[PDB]
Amino acid sequence: DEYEIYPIPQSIKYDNSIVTLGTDANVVFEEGIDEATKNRLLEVLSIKGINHEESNEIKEDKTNFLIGINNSEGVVDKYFTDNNLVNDSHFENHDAHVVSVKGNVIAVLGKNTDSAFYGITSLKAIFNQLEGNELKELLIEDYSDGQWRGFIEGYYGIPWSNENRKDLMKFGGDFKMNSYIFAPKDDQYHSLKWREPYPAEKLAEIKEMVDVGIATKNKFIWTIHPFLKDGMNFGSEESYKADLEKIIAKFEQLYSVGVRQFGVLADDAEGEANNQVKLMEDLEKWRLQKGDVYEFIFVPKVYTKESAGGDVNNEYLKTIGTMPETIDIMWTGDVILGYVTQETFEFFEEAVGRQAFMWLNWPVNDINNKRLLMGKGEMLDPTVTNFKGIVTNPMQEAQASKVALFAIADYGWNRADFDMDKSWKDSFKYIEPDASEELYTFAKHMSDPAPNWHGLSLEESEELRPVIEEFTRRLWEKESVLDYSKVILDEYQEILDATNNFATKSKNELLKSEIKGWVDSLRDLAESTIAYINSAVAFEKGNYEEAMKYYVLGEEEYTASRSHRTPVINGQSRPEPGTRHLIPFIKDLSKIIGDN
């Protein structure tokens, strides 16, 4: 009966009473609430076609929305104090805020405007699932476990379109993400030509994305690679001063279109570590002058335990750790495709001197372009506490990446209550409202990146696996397959139907065209499996001419499944879903039938 809210709030409380929403509402914003935060409430009101007037007090006759900041001594702060709803002990936490639904008052108090925004986003989630105009009285006391939650465009591949970058920011913003790190490898102006200002057309495109960032609060974070061969010149005091002028100029250019957070990337850095610190010391001075720039993100040259030699006295990391305390240094784990583990963070802390900001290399598919990776968050350990936050490095397929964005958002916000299996399942309705069963069906069979050179292996087809295995043993151990074939044909018919109904049901052209090749391949796999199962059945019943034709149909469909092509940076790639269990089963069937 209670509302489904993602990420899972740290604490939500209901009482017996319910409230009725009016057609006309009174809205009270404190002075600290910014334009993006006001607009967020107005979005929420229009979900239920509630008109509003703005005022400075609670109207007893109407429904009231009050948005305020803790300890402002504003109207809304006063309301919370005077009515004695919460604890100041709450607000020290990251992104801490309170949502209160009581009588004709719907209130949000955040530690700042950003947190008030998150509060209103929770209301957005609530309002989207309200049957009518009745609303349960509740109290959310919420905060984030992680400082940073979001995604980084940091793979090798085709860059996302601007349309898609905006759409992901819009998506992350619905789940309280705060970070989009813009690090596309093809942008000459963030790297190599970092000295030169962005062309005006390109800058104007950036400003459109930054504005979406401001509206959704999934901020656009710009990044730079200044330590390449032709990079920052540390030859002399003179030459360095010349180069520091340019980097700051470049930062000013981005600042001028609204960028308020920056990353410095040293994964490909050339000189000494000391120099990297020197620069960051100078950039920190700048950052404090500006007053409204969030803290820098730094990606070190040594970003895995493996490349650190497993040395907790690693010289590079020790030096990097002497840069200003405010800088968030990133880490991918023990290896490039590291899992989230307590041990990797203990190592990082011992070596660097502060907690890590996790760069998660999933579901990036540059490791295997044949794959869509849309499985659950297997790499996310809910018991790990010792890190600053997490970003996902997703696929070149932007829309398909929404599955992981949901996972990282939920896990990033509320770690202990992360339910890998449930969160994954619940996500599909948000990602794809019209075809959620279908897209969930696809995600079930598209998740294993193996084989790959790093050796990452994730589950795929997990629910179907026991059914596949049982049919195989029955067939191979010379038992009847007549009855079980019904069970497994049901499973495959569901897959097939999903691949046939999806394009009809989904209204998301961007997702449809992105994943089409994979759905085409999966359709063929489903048809192939059905033909083979049909062949085995015909064979048991003794209709040999018929089982022959099915076998042939089975062979043709498998070949068909391999006939599709999708774009990659250098040319074309063959989409290949269902490799963990679906394809092995097809191969098994074709070997057993007729040699049985």
Under 8 Å between Cβ of 522 and 578: yes
359 vs 340: CA distance, rounded Å: 10
Q: What DSSP letter does each residue of 410-440 carry, written as one string?
A: HHHH-STT--HHHHHHHHHHHH-SSSHHHHH
CA distances from 32 to 72, 91, 551 (A): 8, 16, 70
Q: Which residues contact 81 (CB under 8 A, 6 or more apart)?
A: none
Structure tokens at 481: 């397959």
Measured in whole angstroms, how far is the alpha carbon of residue 469 from the centre of its chain?
33
Under 8 Å between Cβ of 262 and 292: no
Structure tokens at 518: 């994979």
Query: Please, which residues bridge with residue 182 across strands?
Result: 153, 222
Measured in whole angstroms, how far is the alpha carbon of residue 436 from the centre of its chain?
18
> How do beta strands 148-153 and 94-102 pair?
unpaired
For the chain, what is the radius of gyration of the CA atoms? 27
456 vs 378: CA distance, rounded Å: 11
Residue carrying structure tokens 């064979």: 539
Which strand ranges, in their side-by-side order, compose the sheet holding 51-54? 12-20, 134-144, 94-102, 105-110, 63-69, 24-29, 51-54
381 is catalytic: no
Measured in whole angstroms, how far is the alpha carbon of residue 450 from the centre of its chain?
21
Using DSSP, state whether 333 is helix, strand or coil: strand
Structure tokens at 40: 């967020």
194 vs 247: CA distance, rounded Å: 7
Nearest CA among 394, 396, 397 for reference residue 409: 394
How was this structure determined? It was done by: X-ray
Under 8 Å between Cβ of 141 and 90: yes
> How do beta strands 328-331 and 356-360 pair?
parallel
Nearest CA among 585, 294, 578, 316 for reference residue 448: 578
> How do beta strands 328-331 and 387-392 pair?
unpaired
Residue carrying structure tokens 């700051």: 248
93 vs 80: CA distance, rounded Å: 18
Measured on CA atoms in the order 582, 583, 584, 586, is the torsion positive or negative?
Answer: positive
Q: Which residues contact 389 (CB under 8 A, 6 or more apart)?
A: 146, 147, 148, 149, 179, 328, 357, 358, 412
Q: Is 383 exposed, middle or buried (0-12, 13-18, 19+ CB in 10 A)?
A: exposed
Distance between first and last Cα of the chain: 54
Selected catalytic residue, list 24, 186, 230, 268: 268
Under 8 Å between Cβ of 334 and 310: no
Structure tokens at 79: 């309301």
Helices of type H across 464-592: 465-476, 482-505, 509-541, 544-560, 582-592
Nearest CA among 4, 209, 221, 36 for reference residue 117: 36
Assess whether the previous peptide bond of 451 is cis (omega < 30° from 0).
yes
Structure tokens at 308: 């650190």
198 vs 188: CA distance, rounded Å: 9
Structure tokens at 270: 């050339």
3-state helix, strand, coil in the chain (%, to 5): 45, 15, 40
Under 8 Å between Cβ of 149 and 176: yes
Query: Directed axis angle between helix 273-290 and helix 237-255, to 10°?
Result: 40
31 vs 74: CA distance, rounded Å: 8
283: region left, alpha or beta (phi > 0 left; psi from -120 to 50 alpha): alpha
Under 8 Å between Cβ of 195 and 246: yes
Q: What are residue 142's phi and psi, to 5 degrees?
A: -120, 155
563 vs 507: CA distance, rounded Å: 26
Assess whether the previous peptide bond of 7 is cis (omega < 30° from 0).
yes
Q: What DSSP letter does each residue of 19-80 carry, written as one string?
A: EE--SEEEEEE-TT--HHHHHHHHHHHHHTT-EEEE-SS--TTSEEEEEEETTS-SHHHHHH
Structure tokens at 315: 């010289």
Residue carrying structure tokens 């702060």: 77
Query: Directed axis angle between helix 509-541 and helix 436-444, to 10°?
Result: 60
H/E segment holding residue 242: helix 237-255
Under 8 Å between Cβ of 553 and 516: no
Helices of type H across 178-221: 200-216
**What is the residue type of 149?**
R
538 vs 52: CA distance, rounded Å: 68
**What is the residue type of 497?**
D
Neighbours of 142 (CB within 10 A): 26
Under 8 Å between Cβ of 402 and 167: no
Nearest CA among 167, 150, 582, 576 for reference residue 373: 576
Under 8 Å between Cβ of 521 and 562: yes
Measured on CA atoms in the order 264, 266, 268, 269, is the torsion positive or negative?
Answer: positive
Under 8 Å between Cβ of 120 and 67: yes
Measured in whole angstroms, how far is the alpha carbon of residue 352 from the centre of its chain?
27
Using DSSP, state whether 14 is helix, strand or coil: strand
